[PDB]
């Protein structure tokens, strides 16, 4: 298992444009793609992501090459941010994954507000940062997920998803 079947697994495969579950659309493997109720806006950042005229739909190969950015994205973005790189330098293989998982489904501002789960993920505490990751909004919307990525990060195993 790696990071890219992981999150192919928690966010699935859309061809057309949707709205995720927090409203807001989206297309391909979780590739987000505006926060305006507008769906014209959407499909106008849909082109340009793109480079051609959608019409709001796409092939499985242009998805994944969204899905390729965005995960390369993900991990450049936790390797710059001050807060998260000593974090990540920290954990093993299996524990990497689940922080780019966050990232990529909450960004790395959303991630890096998690202080007290990251300095207990640091010093290696797996038990009790699960318990803390818990206590947030984000366990609260999607608990599925949620406790797909705790579980990664308490065993650093990859059970949860086999
Ligand atoms: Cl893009
Ligand atoms: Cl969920």
């Known amino acids: 298992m790696n990071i890219?079947?992981?999150?192919?697994?928690?966010?699935g495969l859309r061809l057309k444009i949707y709205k995720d579950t927090?409203?807001?659309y989206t297309i391909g493997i979780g590739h987000l793609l505006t926060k305006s109720p507008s769906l014209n806006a959407a499909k106008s950042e849909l082109d340009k992501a793109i480079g051609r005229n959608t019409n709001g739909v796409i092939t499985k190969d242009e998805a994944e090459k969204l899905f390729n950015?965005?995960?390369d994205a993900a991990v450049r973005g936790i390797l710059?941010?001050?807060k998260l790189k000593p974090v990540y330098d920290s954990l093993d293989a299996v524990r990497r994954a689940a922080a780019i998982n966050m990232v990529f489904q909450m960004g790395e501002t959303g991630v890096a507000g998690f202080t007290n789960s990251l300095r207990?993920?640091?010093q290696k505490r797996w038990d009790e940062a699960?318990?803390?990751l818990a206590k947030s909004r984000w366990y609260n919307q999607t608990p599925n997920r949620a406790k797909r990525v705790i579980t990664t990060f308490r065993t650093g195993t990859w059970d949860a998803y086999k």
């Not at 890219?4 to 966010?11: K, N, S, Y």
């Open 4 to 11: 890219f079947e992981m999150l192919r697994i928690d966010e």
């Open 22 to 24: 927090e409203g807001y």
């Open 69 to 71: 950015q965005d995960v």
């Open 80 to 82: 710059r941010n001050a």
């Open 120 to 122: 207990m993920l640091q």
């Open 130 to 132: 699960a318990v803390n």
